[PDB]
Amino acid sequence: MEIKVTEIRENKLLGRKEIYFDVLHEGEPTPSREAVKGKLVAMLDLDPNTTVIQYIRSYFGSNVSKGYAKAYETRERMLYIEPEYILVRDGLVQK
């Protein structure tokens, strides 16, 4: 599995970086959120916390999936802005 960033935007009003990336997985299954986040931060020099992946989506026959993440500056703003269901879905938070 490999990653390839495709568009970064900065939102100063909400205080985050919106990151659209591609994932390449030929002959392999759809990767897991853990691995995707690991490689994302290992590459772009981010804190694992303060970072949430919204979605990894695969298409009909491609081997090329798409993904969208959000990198925050501080965990307080992170938790005040993002809804709880994605935090529970990633694992940053227990119910």
Binding site: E26, G27, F60, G61, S62, N63
Partner: protein, 174 residues
């Protein structure tokens, strides 16, 4: 009033049991390995729509008529039915066999990737064929002019192997 429901994109015949028509259509169905008459009828319908558009636009006045003439010719070019130096009367010389030539099953048989039309169909439906990089599983896709030379076996597919037995058998024909 009433709202509109979705309508069929094919037209059935006026009389069901006419011998000349039955013979023609039997030949076509057999030779292009079609499953039903619906498919033949929907390609006939495509052609009839093109013809009606040309008939309406021919000898008409205004700006939109010119725009639509050029749009129609560009579309037929892009689909592979007319050349570029084509005039609007050349639309009225087209037949259903052209539209049947332009479908995936036929092109996959005509390039040599399969021994037969029914084999071509099975390849497509099972997922062994790629167009412009993308797997397509519909044997009536109507390939475009600038997609034809990119049609090959799918990357992950047994036939991608130069030594597959069925691929050896297939190539043995050529």
């Amino acid at each position: 009033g009433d709202p509109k429901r979705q309508r069929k994109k094919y037209e059935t015949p006026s009389h069901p049991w006419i011998k000349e028509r039955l013979d023609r259509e039997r030949v076509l169905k057999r030779n292009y390995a079609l499953k039903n008459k619906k498919e033949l009828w929907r390609h006939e319908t495509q052609l009839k729509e093109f013809r009606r558009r040309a008939r309406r636009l021919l000898a008409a006045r205004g700006k939109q008529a010119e725009i639509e003439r050029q749009q129609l010719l560009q579309r037929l070019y892009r689909l592979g039915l007319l050349p570029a130096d084509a005039v609007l009367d050349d639309v009225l010389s087209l037949t259903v066999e052209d539209v049947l030539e332009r479908r995936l099953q036929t092109i996959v048989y005509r390039k040599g990737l399969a021994r037969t039309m029914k084999q071509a169909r099975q390849l497509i439906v099972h997922g062994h064929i790629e167009v412009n990089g993308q797997v397509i599983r519909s044997p009536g896709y109507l390939v475009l002019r600038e997609e034809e030379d990119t049609i090959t076996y799918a990357k992950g597919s047994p036939f991608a192997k130069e030594g597959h037995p069925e691929r050896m058998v297939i190539e043995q024909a050529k």
